[PDB]
């Protein structure tokens, strides 16, 4: 009823503000120019790295809590970006914006999916939310440019912060240790996208003159993704087989021997047996814990692999020296997906919209002139091109 | 069996060569430079305009016939583009490639969908075909550049023509007055994309300095699309009710029915009534014929509207003068879709992949440097951004 419409409005505004914050910086780029590529892609990289952790956190705790802290982070980071003047401060504010926007978007989409039960209504709500997400990137630049050129210099950022604050207030009123681990995760995700070397002294002449070297250096990520997509399946099959192999003995005067080898919840189960439903419940209750632990392990392993590869990239003097790191990165981005797809399905849509809007805006701003070459965003774009049309 | 695998291989190769032909020209652009945006986007514009007509033609006649003429057109136009040296000849060859590739791709995808009956197998085949379609754009530039800078000047075009010929031969051997209307349809689609004034004398300065003018000029196509999406539904609902009302009076005793009967095929049907199944069959078949005629009419009307708008575009003297033509174009592109989606569903996937690959390649080539602003491709991109994530 009224609550469903309120939730839909809140989620729509959250996604719209997310993409507006992503794209609004395009008309201001020449003014700063009087390095740019990394400053532009930092938010997208951070969000694309940190989405699955927020998904798992919302699965564990719940939906309403992450949205408020996401709104607060977005507000604080937007204000800091508005009032900052130094390159490092701008980059830090951009990364904070990325984390906050990712958390808010994922949690809001999850709650909106949870509220609607009927299939067709759920599809309509998803369509409206994704439409707002997609049209934010187009409404960004004109709104930003008109406010920038009529009134003030930092007006668009303050207006967006005010909108964020108003939406948070509407969510709060009208609607009716682990901490160190979360801090470490946030800091690692910031650090991965904050620092990136490129060796532009000889790399520029390399890509401009000959592109076949670029292709042979950058395509093996596609093979690595396919190789790494199977890890969760393999491990889950092994874990499922292991428990049933043990329980086969219990499956089989001998009953007293079975009770003896059983020998305190398991003891109580063995006593109350002397059935099939009990062992079914036992398997189900252990299986979920195994799944959750394995998902956490694979997410951490993927983050570690990406960090190690980005730390190992700069120590190369040839194009072929770039073959080894790429094979790493495309692996990790695969593995994480293998654990997240069965439970949540809108991560593909969010990543696709973000990447495609970023490419659209970059093409527009590049055409506008008449800036640096991002490394991880190229891999993300290649993977998206190859495997998002196939998935749909 | 062998037949299904052979069809899958043929369709995969056809789609791969389609996209490779689309993208391979990128590394050659700077060499030719030492005007170009239209030359790059002509093929995409022509294909996106001419897809639905080929879809209807294949629905009417059959799948095998269009593929062979598409292969022949692709071969001839690729050779002509290879051996040409003048701007007009290059543009004409590009448009011919566009028509041939569109026909081959649509017909092959249709036949591949037709062969597979099982749902999961059909999904797998569609996934493989779209994977080839999507990887063509990445395999294009490296292959083209390496062939260009190792051997010869026109080697990649000849190699692609040879591959086209080999695939056509495999299709022909191993596998076991409307004409003037089709000619006019082809010529009009060529002419729409061949000529575009775009008025670049002062549009660039008022587009780069201020972006809100660009937004207010280009966004209303999104509203026009939503308005025009309902045309087929409204017309079909009106048409069905008119036929139903006439027969409902006679639907209802027997004496009155005979009395009305007192006043060749229709006579035979009326005699054999003296039942319900005959009425059902009559209604279904006449409705089907009416729907087919209405689809043809709306496709022609959309083409006419687009042509009139592109002829009326150059007259405008101010930015606001571009508001009226856009409201036209976004209408037609909507209306055609309203008639094509219920029967065929891969048109959205084909258009999305083509547009997104084109934007990716344009961004790459623009980034590599260090002119030309397409008009209709911008509208297509806006519509795709806004309404493809929602549709998926």
XYZ file of C-alpha atoms in Angstrom:
784
model
C 0.000 0.000 0.000
C 1.407 3.364 1.092
C 4.578 1.777 2.496
C 5.366 0.079 -0.820
C 5.099 3.382 -2.687
C 7.273 5.079 -0.064
C 9.959 2.393 -0.394
C 9.857 2.626 -4.190
C 10.243 6.413 -4.066
C 13.154 6.195 -1.612
C 15.027 3.594 -3.668
C 14.398 5.477 -6.924
C 15.778 8.708 -5.478
C 18.784 6.891 -3.996
C 19.757 5.327 -7.332
C 19.179 8.592 -9.207
C 21.427 10.490 -6.794
C 24.051 7.740 -7.053
C 24.394 8.094 -10.813
C 24.097 11.896 -10.717
C 27.014 11.968 -8.278
C 28.967 9.651 -10.576
C 28.516 11.682 -13.757
C 28.088 15.348 -12.722
C 31.851 16.036 -12.791
C 32.158 15.892 -16.600
C 31.475 19.589 -17.437
C 33.891 20.716 -14.687
C 36.867 18.745 -16.060
C 38.214 21.508 -18.376
C 38.115 24.003 -15.494
C 40.306 21.715 -13.381
C 42.549 21.102 -16.397
C 43.175 24.876 -16.642
C 45.693 12.221 -13.563
C 42.181 13.041 -14.763
C 41.339 9.475 -15.784
C 42.136 7.989 -12.380
C 40.228 10.771 -10.621
C 37.208 10.021 -12.813
C 37.323 6.217 -12.534
C 38.113 5.962 -8.805
C 34.454 5.939 -7.743
C 33.433 3.313 -10.300
C 36.382 1.060 -9.450
C 35.734 1.277 -5.703
C 32.013 0.574 -6.067
C 32.562 -2.369 -8.418
C 35.085 -3.830 -5.978
C 32.992 -3.348 -2.831
C 29.496 -4.372 -4.000
C 29.626 -8.101 -3.011
C 30.768 -7.429 0.560
C 27.804 -5.104 1.090
C 25.581 -7.787 -0.406
C 26.806 -10.365 2.102
C 26.525 -7.882 4.977
C 22.910 -7.080 4.092
C 22.171 -10.800 3.811
C 23.550 -11.297 7.326
C 22.334 -8.289 9.329
C 19.491 -6.702 7.380
C 18.484 -4.001 4.919
C 17.547 -0.822 6.865
C 20.845 -0.378 8.757
C 23.288 -0.115 5.792
C 21.192 2.480 3.937
C 21.477 5.112 6.666
C 25.250 4.802 7.004
C 25.509 4.895 3.213
C 23.517 8.132 3.124
C 25.695 9.650 5.855
C 28.900 8.634 4.060
C 27.608 10.080 0.785
C 26.691 13.384 2.444
C 30.022 13.763 4.253
C 32.090 12.790 1.212
C 30.150 15.109 -1.106
C 30.672 18.057 1.247
C 34.383 17.259 1.590
C 34.761 17.020 -2.195
C 32.940 20.338 -2.557
C 35.249 22.169 -0.143
C 38.539 20.466 -1.058
C 41.298 21.901 -3.248
C 44.116 19.303 -3.261
C 44.494 16.271 -5.514
C 44.822 13.745 -2.682
C 41.791 15.138 -0.847
C 39.732 15.002 -4.044
C 40.721 11.372 -4.638
C 39.938 10.407 -1.034
C 36.532 12.104 -1.200
C 35.793 10.344 -4.494
C 36.593 6.949 -2.961
C 34.423 7.684 0.088
C 31.587 8.647 -2.262
C 32.080 5.344 -4.059
C 31.803 3.251 -0.898
C 28.760 5.142 0.356
C 26.937 4.986 -2.973
C 27.635 1.267 -3.382
C 26.305 0.480 0.091
C 23.172 2.608 -0.313
C 22.353 1.277 -3.782
C 22.798 -2.406 -2.926
C 20.865 -2.204 0.345
C 18.009 -0.207 -1.181
C 17.670 -2.559 -4.137
C 17.645 -5.519 -1.760
C 14.896 -4.062 0.415
C 12.799 -3.077 -2.606
C 13.066 -6.616 -3.971
C 12.167 -8.011 -0.539
C 9.012 -5.919 -0.075
C 7.302 -6.930 -3.332
C 6.051 -10.530 -3.329
C 3.958 -10.745 -6.507
C 6.098 -11.566 -9.527
C 4.758 -8.991 -11.993
C 4.750 -6.200 -9.401
C 8.321 -7.140 -8.471
C 9.296 -6.920 -12.135
C 7.636 -3.518 -12.468
C 9.436 -2.198 -9.381
C 12.780 -3.513 -10.634
C 12.127 -1.900 -14.008
C 11.346 1.489 -12.472
C 14.398 1.386 -10.195
C 16.753 0.402 -13.022
C 15.208 3.075 -15.245
C 16.033 5.706 -12.647
C 19.537 4.270 -12.292
C 20.055 4.413 -16.060
C 18.641 7.911 -16.580
C 20.697 9.433 -13.768
C 23.753 9.403 -16.031
C 21.961 11.446 -18.703
C 20.402 13.922 -16.277
C 23.782 14.479 -14.596
C 25.843 16.642 -16.969
C 23.159 19.157 -18.058
C 22.029 19.790 -14.475
C 25.617 20.168 -13.303
C 26.586 22.481 -16.157
C 23.570 24.768 -15.786
C 24.047 25.171 -12.032
C 27.799 25.655 -12.466
C 27.443 28.365 -15.098
C 24.511 30.299 -13.613
C 25.086 30.285 -9.842
C 28.355 29.822 -7.990
C 31.126 27.259 -8.373
C 30.263 24.588 -5.777
C 26.471 24.841 -6.111
C 25.782 21.403 -7.710
C 27.644 19.528 -4.967
C 25.745 21.351 -2.217
C 22.428 20.757 -4.002
C 23.175 17.036 -4.294
C 24.171 16.916 -0.618
C 20.902 18.629 0.323
C 18.935 16.093 -1.727
C 20.804 13.237 -0.026
C 20.033 14.712 3.398
C 16.346 15.168 2.561
C 16.032 11.588 1.301
C 17.739 10.291 4.438
C 15.378 12.299 6.637
C 12.360 10.957 4.734
C 13.667 7.413 5.197
C 14.275 7.955 8.916
C 11.031 9.661 9.944
C 8.140 8.916 7.576
C 9.011 5.261 6.949
C 7.730 2.926 9.664
C 35.846 -7.757 16.192
C 33.627 -7.252 13.141
C 34.125 -3.476 13.214
C 37.882 -3.728 12.645
C 37.214 -6.182 9.810
C 34.834 -3.720 8.147
C 37.376 -0.930 8.563
C 40.109 -3.081 7.033
C 37.860 -4.000 4.095
C 36.988 -0.353 3.444
C 40.617 0.768 3.675
C 41.826 -2.017 1.372
C 39.166 -1.198 -1.224
C 40.180 2.468 -1.055
C 43.875 1.637 -1.362
C 43.469 -0.660 -4.361
C 41.835 2.063 -6.470
C 43.692 5.048 -4.989
C 47.211 4.167 -6.215
C 48.025 3.022 -9.774
C 51.236 3.443 -11.817
C 51.251 3.146 -15.620
C 54.783 3.834 -16.963
C 53.612 6.332 -19.623
C 57.164 6.995 -20.870
C 57.143 4.082 -23.338
C 53.601 2.719 -22.966
C 52.005 5.572 -24.949
C 54.201 4.969 -27.994
C 53.413 1.277 -27.585
C 49.629 1.470 -27.772
C 49.394 4.314 -30.280
C 51.662 2.792 -32.928
C 50.718 -0.900 -32.667
C 47.474 -2.302 -31.267
C 48.102 -6.039 -31.711
C 50.485 -5.977 -28.745
C 47.736 -4.331 -26.692
C 45.295 -7.049 -27.722
C 47.625 -9.937 -26.952
C 48.379 -8.335 -23.577
C 44.754 -7.664 -22.586
C 42.625 -10.543 -23.950
C 43.709 -13.474 -21.660
C 41.500 -12.032 -18.889
C 38.559 -13.467 -20.842
C 40.002 -16.985 -20.560
C 40.886 -16.439 -16.895
C 37.272 -15.466 -16.139
C 35.934 -18.697 -17.643
C 38.528 -20.748 -15.763
C 37.726 -19.076 -12.447
C 33.935 -19.220 -12.712
C 33.945 -22.890 -11.564
C 35.643 -22.621 -8.150
C 32.511 -22.328 -6.018
C 30.869 -25.220 -7.838
C 33.870 -27.501 -7.366
C 34.293 -26.681 -3.676
C 30.564 -26.987 -2.959
C 30.411 -30.386 -4.659
C 33.375 -31.602 -2.604
C 31.843 -30.369 0.656
C 28.466 -31.927 -0.164
C 30.064 -35.280 -1.015
C 32.155 -35.326 2.164
C 29.180 -35.126 4.545
C 27.114 -37.766 2.743
C 30.081 -40.150 2.678
C 30.297 -39.859 6.470
C 26.533 -40.190 6.952
C 26.321 -43.310 4.762
C 27.369 -45.382 7.788
C 24.434 -44.040 9.811
C 22.183 -44.576 6.784
C 22.684 -48.350 7.056
C 21.009 -55.673 17.168
C 23.121 -53.582 14.793
C 21.123 -50.504 15.820
C 22.718 -50.669 19.270
C 26.118 -50.612 17.562
C 25.033 -47.571 15.540
C 23.985 -45.801 18.739
C 27.333 -46.697 20.318
C 29.358 -45.297 17.407
C 27.205 -42.162 17.534
C 28.344 -41.723 21.146
C 25.258 -33.042 23.107
C 22.667 -32.248 20.455
C 23.911 -35.120 18.282
C 23.552 -37.486 21.250
C 19.987 -36.251 21.762
C 19.296 -36.826 18.057
C 20.639 -40.370 18.286
C 18.501 -41.028 21.355
C 15.279 -39.649 19.857
C 15.868 -41.654 16.676
C 15.470 -44.868 18.689
C 14.391 -40.474 11.531
C 14.801 -39.386 7.910
C 13.472 -35.901 8.668
C 16.065 -35.507 11.428
C 19.013 -36.280 9.145
C 17.484 -34.065 6.453
C 17.326 -31.165 8.916
C 20.889 -31.906 10.058
C 22.181 -31.768 6.480
C 20.276 -28.553 5.742
C 21.448 -26.800 8.903
C 25.119 -27.630 8.334
C 24.950 -26.927 4.590
C 23.983 -23.267 5.006
C 26.869 -22.593 7.395
C 29.270 -24.297 4.991
C 27.974 -22.159 2.111
C 28.309 -18.913 4.070
C 31.835 -19.659 5.282
C 32.966 -20.668 1.798
C 31.498 -17.482 0.304
C 33.349 -15.318 2.824
C 36.593 -17.190 2.135
C 36.282 -16.838 -1.641
C 35.503 -13.115 -1.422
C 38.563 -12.516 0.764
C 40.740 -14.623 -1.545
C 39.590 -12.659 -4.589
C 40.350 -9.346 -2.901
C 43.807 -10.604 -1.889
C 44.573 -11.807 -5.425
C 43.533 -8.475 -6.947
C 45.682 -6.591 -4.441
C 48.716 -8.781 -5.079
C 48.347 -8.378 -8.850
C 48.022 -4.592 -8.634
C 51.108 -4.523 -6.399
C 53.058 -6.733 -8.833
C 52.099 -4.836 -12.021
C 54.708 -2.007 -11.953
C 57.757 -4.330 -12.066
C 57.635 -4.970 -15.818
C 59.660 -3.613 -18.732
C 57.916 -5.284 -21.698
C 54.409 -5.740 -23.056
C 54.622 -9.490 -22.460
C 55.507 -8.736 -18.837
C 51.866 -7.632 -18.525
C 50.615 -11.120 -19.461
C 51.015 -12.575 -15.962
C 49.157 -9.923 -13.879
C 46.085 -9.882 -16.141
C 45.637 -13.647 -15.830
C 45.444 -13.013 -12.097
C 42.858 -10.234 -12.113
C 40.418 -11.904 -14.490
C 40.559 -14.955 -12.238
C 39.464 -13.148 -9.076
C 36.611 -11.205 -10.685
C 35.377 -14.563 -11.931
C 35.577 -16.419 -8.626
C 33.617 -13.852 -6.612
C 30.820 -13.938 -9.185
C 30.580 -17.717 -8.843
C 29.522 -17.254 -5.218
C 27.196 -14.254 -5.554
C 25.022 -15.026 -8.584
C 22.721 -17.712 -7.058
C 21.557 -15.481 -4.193
C 21.467 -12.030 -5.846
C 20.845 -11.253 -9.493
C 20.864 -7.467 -9.820
C 24.645 -7.167 -9.366
C 25.082 -7.792 -13.100
C 22.618 -5.010 -13.913
C 24.274 -2.548 -11.526
C 27.778 -3.258 -12.829
C 26.650 -3.132 -16.464
C 24.870 0.205 -16.067
C 27.804 1.738 -14.187
C 30.416 0.613 -16.726
C 28.363 1.567 -19.783
C 27.518 4.999 -18.391
C 31.186 5.573 -17.579
C 32.234 4.659 -21.129
C 29.524 6.923 -22.574
C 30.659 9.881 -20.452
C 34.341 9.276 -21.241
C 33.612 9.213 -24.971
C 31.618 12.441 -24.678
C 34.313 14.296 -22.719
C 37.062 13.027 -25.029
C 35.096 14.314 -28.020
C 34.570 17.630 -26.216
C 38.263 18.559 -26.352
C 39.288 20.106 -29.661
C 44.443 12.131 -19.714
C 45.834 8.821 -18.513
C 44.980 5.216 -19.312
C 43.171 3.254 -16.570
C 44.284 -0.353 -16.189
C 41.627 -2.202 -14.182
C 38.688 -0.436 -15.836
C 39.859 -1.823 -19.185
C 39.674 -5.373 -17.805
C 36.224 -4.695 -16.354
C 35.028 -3.319 -19.685
C 36.369 -6.306 -21.624
C 34.685 -8.761 -19.256
C 31.426 -6.799 -19.404
C 31.396 -6.641 -23.219
C 32.073 -10.344 -23.604
C 29.853 -11.804 -20.899
C 26.933 -9.464 -20.134
C 25.038 -9.897 -23.461
C 25.517 -13.653 -23.072
C 24.133 -13.565 -19.522
C 21.001 -11.610 -20.477
C 23.164 -34.412 -34.618
C 25.371 -33.097 -37.423
C 22.717 -30.716 -38.762
C 22.318 -28.747 -35.525
C 26.074 -28.385 -35.005
C 26.587 -27.277 -38.612
C 23.878 -24.611 -38.324
C 25.376 -23.381 -35.049
C 28.836 -23.129 -36.622
C 27.511 -21.277 -39.682
C 25.555 -18.749 -37.613
C 28.478 -18.216 -35.224
C 30.874 -17.498 -38.087
C 28.352 -15.189 -39.770
C 27.892 -13.069 -36.638
C 31.634 -12.991 -35.928
C 32.396 -11.779 -39.455
C 29.586 -9.211 -39.218
C 31.066 -7.540 -36.152
C 34.659 -7.903 -37.375
C 33.664 -6.099 -40.573
C 32.012 -3.390 -38.479
C 35.012 -2.694 -36.253
C 38.159 -3.532 -38.280
C 38.410 -0.023 -39.785
C 39.541 1.655 -36.541
C 43.355 1.214 -36.849
C 43.265 2.464 -40.469
C 41.600 5.797 -39.607
C 44.729 7.804 -38.609
C 46.656 6.548 -41.644
C 43.842 7.582 -43.991
C 43.465 10.941 -42.235
C 47.039 11.982 -43.054
C 33.688 13.614 -42.544
C 34.956 10.532 -40.723
C 32.233 10.084 -38.091
C 29.574 9.620 -40.762
C 31.836 7.194 -42.624
C 32.232 5.164 -39.430
C 28.568 5.209 -38.371
C 26.983 4.613 -41.796
C 27.010 0.814 -41.477
C 25.520 0.825 -37.976
C 22.812 3.324 -38.937
C 21.824 1.361 -42.049
C 21.698 -1.966 -40.210
C 19.680 -0.560 -37.308
C 17.210 0.960 -39.767
C 16.828 -2.126 -41.970
C 16.657 -4.954 -39.403
C 12.824 -5.116 -38.977
C 12.107 -5.314 -42.713
C 14.436 -8.304 -43.035
C 12.717 -9.831 -40.020
C 9.299 -9.535 -41.657
C 10.644 -10.833 -44.975
C 12.139 -13.912 -43.308
C 8.874 -14.480 -41.439
C 7.050 -14.432 -44.781
C 9.314 -16.344 -47.178
C 11.774 -18.365 -45.111
C 15.232 -18.395 -43.580
C 17.618 -20.034 -46.118
C 17.012 -17.619 -49.026
C 18.002 -14.294 -47.355
C 21.279 -15.670 -45.966
C 22.783 -16.404 -49.380
C 21.978 -12.979 -50.819
C 23.324 -11.406 -47.632
C 26.594 -13.303 -48.025
C 26.858 -12.280 -51.684
C 26.172 -8.621 -50.862
C 28.774 -8.686 -48.083
C 31.402 -10.211 -50.380
C 30.784 -7.783 -53.250
C 30.673 -4.705 -51.024
C 33.795 -5.718 -49.092
C 35.728 -6.136 -52.346
C 34.453 -2.781 -53.631
C 35.455 -1.065 -50.376
C 38.882 -2.695 -50.617
C 39.532 -1.423 -54.145
C 37.883 2.011 -53.881
C 39.668 5.326 -53.353
C 36.966 8.050 -53.374
C 34.814 9.224 -50.476
C 31.447 8.589 -52.138
C 32.404 5.069 -53.225
C 33.632 4.270 -49.713
C 30.337 5.473 -48.230
C 28.302 3.472 -50.757
C 30.314 0.313 -50.064
C 29.888 0.835 -46.317
C 26.108 1.091 -46.708
C 26.031 -2.041 -48.883
C 27.994 -3.905 -46.207
C 25.452 -2.676 -43.673
C 22.475 -4.048 -45.597
C 24.156 -7.373 -46.325
C 25.331 -7.892 -42.750
C 21.918 -7.016 -41.315
C 20.159 -9.482 -43.611
C 22.626 -12.308 -42.956
C 22.649 -11.811 -39.183
C 18.869 -11.632 -38.768
C 18.163 -14.601 -41.040
C 20.860 -16.775 -39.467
C 19.735 -16.005 -35.929
C 16.152 -16.793 -36.905
C 17.051 -20.156 -38.417
C 19.239 -21.091 -35.445
C 16.384 -20.284 -33.067
C 13.995 -22.298 -35.250
C 16.136 -25.453 -35.337
C 16.473 -25.862 -31.559
C 13.250 -26.952 -29.844
C 14.316 -27.744 -26.271
C 14.334 -24.659 -24.068
C 17.727 -25.053 -22.383
C 19.432 -26.082 -25.629
C 17.882 -23.061 -27.355
C 19.196 -20.826 -24.580
C 22.677 -22.320 -24.897
C 22.681 -21.812 -28.673
C 21.529 -18.205 -28.291
C 24.243 -17.641 -25.698
C 26.964 -18.987 -27.984
C 25.744 -16.927 -30.948
C 25.611 -13.716 -28.906
C 29.046 -14.531 -27.490
C 30.461 -14.663 -31.002
C 28.638 -11.442 -31.869
C 30.150 -9.726 -28.823
C 33.701 -11.035 -29.287
C 33.801 -9.896 -32.913
C 34.216 -6.267 -31.849
C 37.270 -7.048 -29.701
C 38.910 -9.385 -32.213
C 38.469 -6.759 -34.941
C 41.104 -4.083 -34.262
C 44.102 -6.284 -33.319
C 43.650 -8.588 -36.315
C 43.154 -5.638 -38.645
C 46.190 -3.758 -37.352
C 48.554 -6.737 -37.454
C 47.513 -7.667 -40.995
C 47.771 -4.018 -42.052
C 51.290 -3.443 -40.762
C 52.807 -6.823 -41.637
C 51.544 -7.532 -45.165
C 50.105 -5.254 -47.817
C 47.566 -2.441 -47.662
C 44.223 -4.145 -48.389
C 44.997 -7.562 -46.880
C 42.377 -7.592 -44.054
C 39.509 -6.797 -46.432
C 40.522 -9.579 -48.825
C 40.914 -12.037 -45.936
C 37.443 -11.166 -44.636
C 35.994 -11.544 -48.139
C 37.638 -14.966 -48.446
C 36.154 -16.019 -45.102
C 32.717 -14.813 -46.238
C 33.042 -16.824 -49.453
C 34.148 -19.955 -47.591
C 31.240 -19.727 -45.145
C 28.802 -19.232 -48.019
C 30.203 -22.276 -49.812
C 29.888 -24.364 -46.637
C 26.276 -23.224 -46.277
C 25.486 -24.026 -49.913
C 27.101 -27.455 -50.268
C 27.502 -29.253 -46.931
C 24.147 -28.194 -45.472
C 21.257 -30.381 -46.625
C 5.174 -6.693 -57.250
C 7.357 -7.032 -54.170
C 10.739 -6.913 -55.918
C 10.570 -3.206 -56.774
C 9.301 -2.592 -53.239
C 12.389 -4.307 -51.814
C 14.626 -2.285 -54.119
C 12.965 0.938 -52.980
C 13.269 -0.121 -49.322
C 16.999 -0.719 -49.779
C 17.589 2.547 -51.647
C 15.676 4.658 -49.116
C 17.583 3.114 -46.205
C 20.851 3.855 -48.003
C 19.808 7.430 -48.748
C 18.772 8.178 -45.170
C 22.235 7.341 -43.822
C 24.275 8.628 -46.779
C 23.305 12.313 -46.420
C 23.492 14.198 -43.101
C 24.255 17.949 -43.043
C 24.379 18.226 -39.225
C 25.106 21.995 -39.529
C 28.589 22.075 -37.922
C 29.359 25.759 -38.609
C 28.373 26.958 -35.121
C 26.831 23.897 -33.447
C 30.205 22.828 -32.036
C 30.861 26.092 -30.186
C 27.385 26.121 -28.624
C 27.680 22.426 -27.721
C 31.126 22.494 -26.084
C 30.738 25.746 -24.130
C 27.224 24.967 -22.854
C 25.753 21.502 -22.303
C 22.287 22.322 -20.944
C 21.301 23.420 -24.449
C 22.368 20.003 -25.735
C 20.304 18.307 -23.044
C 17.164 20.340 -23.682
C 17.575 19.680 -27.412
C 18.121 15.911 -27.204
C 16.191 14.502 -24.210
C 12.560 14.761 -25.543
C 13.228 11.716 -27.757
C 12.868 9.657 -24.569
C 9.329 10.973 -24.043
C 8.495 10.500 -27.728
C 9.571 6.842 -27.508
C 7.217 6.176 -24.591
C 4.359 7.940 -26.379
C 4.904 5.984 -29.591
C 5.311 2.565 -27.973
C 1.503 2.221 -27.596
C 0.482 2.685 -31.248
C 0.324 -0.986 -32.224
C -1.552 -1.899 -29.056
C -4.158 0.818 -29.562
C -4.639 -0.034 -33.238
C -4.933 -3.776 -32.585
C -7.439 -3.249 -29.770
C -9.532 -0.998 -32.013
C -9.358 -3.419 -34.945
C -10.271 -6.574 -33.008
C -13.341 -5.021 -31.365
C -14.796 -3.904 -34.702
C -14.672 -7.467 -36.037
C -15.985 -8.913 -32.765
C -19.010 -6.601 -32.608
C -20.344 -7.639 -36.021
C -20.337 -11.353 -35.190
C -21.427 -10.966 -31.552
C -24.958 -10.005 -32.608
C -25.338 -13.264 -34.541
C -23.546 -15.139 -31.748
C -26.661 -14.922 -29.533
C -32.883 -18.516 -31.474
C -32.217 -20.794 -34.454
C -35.138 -19.267 -36.369
C -33.637 -15.765 -36.259
C -30.233 -17.159 -37.240
C -31.755 -18.900 -40.268
C -33.684 -15.743 -41.179
C -30.459 -13.726 -41.147
C -28.766 -16.519 -43.117
C -31.409 -16.102 -45.832
C -29.742 -12.797 -46.748
C -17.990 -18.741 -52.259
C -15.984 -19.449 -49.119
C -18.328 -17.341 -46.978
C -21.359 -19.088 -48.489
C -19.817 -22.493 -47.757
C -19.040 -21.484 -44.166
C -22.583 -20.213 -43.659
C -24.019 -23.434 -45.070
C -21.844 -25.631 -42.849
C -22.960 -23.585 -39.843
C -26.506 -24.880 -40.385
C -20.244 -24.248 -35.857
C -18.423 -22.568 -32.971
C -15.068 -23.957 -34.123
C -15.693 -22.579 -37.616
C -16.272 -19.116 -36.143
C -13.127 -19.419 -34.018
C -11.004 -20.426 -37.013
C -12.467 -17.641 -39.165
C -11.789 -15.002 -36.508
C -8.248 -16.252 -35.877
C -7.240 -16.369 -39.540
C -8.734 -12.996 -40.508
C -7.176 -11.470 -37.388
C -3.773 -12.886 -38.346
C -3.977 -11.416 -41.851
C -5.057 -8.048 -40.441
C -2.172 -8.040 -37.949
C 0.349 -8.781 -40.704
C -1.004 -5.964 -42.873
C -0.929 -3.536 -39.946
C 2.682 -4.470 -39.146
C 3.712 -3.744 -42.733
C 1.848 -0.424 -42.652
C 3.425 0.733 -39.389
C 6.929 -0.201 -40.557
C 6.452 1.852 -43.728
C 5.011 4.765 -41.740
C 7.983 4.768 -39.372
C 10.434 4.795 -42.271
C 8.547 7.686 -43.894
C 8.528 9.697 -40.656
C 12.269 9.208 -40.140
C 12.958 10.275 -43.722
C 10.803 13.386 -43.421
C 12.489 14.378 -40.153
C 15.995 13.920 -41.557
C 14.968 15.999 -44.580
C 13.536 18.740 -42.332
C 16.503 18.911 -39.916
C 18.781 21.335 -41.855
C 16.192 24.140 -42.033
C 16.509 25.072 -38.349
C 18.563 28.155 -37.480
C 18.644 27.977 -33.660
C 19.144 25.309 -31.012
C 15.436 25.205 -30.156
C 14.667 24.515 -33.822
C 16.070 21.027 -33.214
C 13.313 20.233 -30.696
C 10.667 19.538 -33.350
C 12.608 16.998 -35.495
C 13.703 14.945 -32.473
C 10.116 14.481 -31.293
C 9.552 12.949 -34.713
C 12.455 10.501 -34.782
C 11.953 9.127 -31.279
C 8.334 8.480 -32.219
C 9.071 6.301 -35.246
C 11.784 4.212 -33.579
C 9.249 3.532 -30.848
C 6.334 2.620 -33.099
C 8.218 0.010 -35.127
C 9.335 -1.690 -31.916
C 5.713 -1.943 -30.782
C 5.052 -4.266 -33.722
C 8.270 -6.303 -33.733
C 8.820 -7.408 -30.126
C 5.937 -9.939 -29.784
C 7.214 -12.158 -32.612
C 11.007 -11.710 -32.370
C 13.014 -10.956 -29.259
C 16.663 -10.897 -30.322
C 16.376 -7.556 -32.146
C 16.985 -5.726 -28.863
C 20.097 -7.819 -28.211
C 21.467 -7.202 -31.712
C 20.860 -3.450 -31.525
C 22.329 -3.211 -28.020
C 25.505 -5.083 -28.946
C 25.988 -3.037 -32.121
C 25.498 0.331 -30.405
C 27.645 -0.511 -27.381
C 30.473 -1.858 -29.529
C 30.348 1.270 -31.684
C 30.556 3.530 -28.621
C 33.442 1.465 -27.223
C 35.388 1.708 -30.492
C 34.730 5.449 -30.855
C 35.924 6.079 -27.301
C 39.069 4.038 -27.954
C 39.937 5.812 -31.212
C 39.255 9.244 -29.701
C 41.466 8.416 -26.712
C 44.254 7.179 -28.996
C 44.668 10.541 -30.742
C 47.095 12.822 -28.926
C 35.893 15.421 -35.986
C 32.273 14.847 -36.960
C 29.147 14.720 -34.800
C 26.552 12.085 -35.778
C 22.933 13.061 -35.212
C 20.770 9.933 -35.413
C 23.310 7.742 -33.614
C 23.028 10.051 -30.598
C 19.263 9.465 -30.464
C 19.777 5.711 -30.801
C 22.330 5.751 -27.989
C 20.056 7.750 -25.685
C 17.143 5.381 -26.300
C 19.386 2.353 -25.766
C 20.827 3.674 -22.485
C 17.421 4.517 -21.068
C 15.386 1.508 -22.155
C 17.636 -1.538 -22.651
C 18.553 -2.119 -18.953
C 14.862 -1.716 -18.114
C 13.852 -4.241 -20.782
C 16.397 -6.858 -19.676
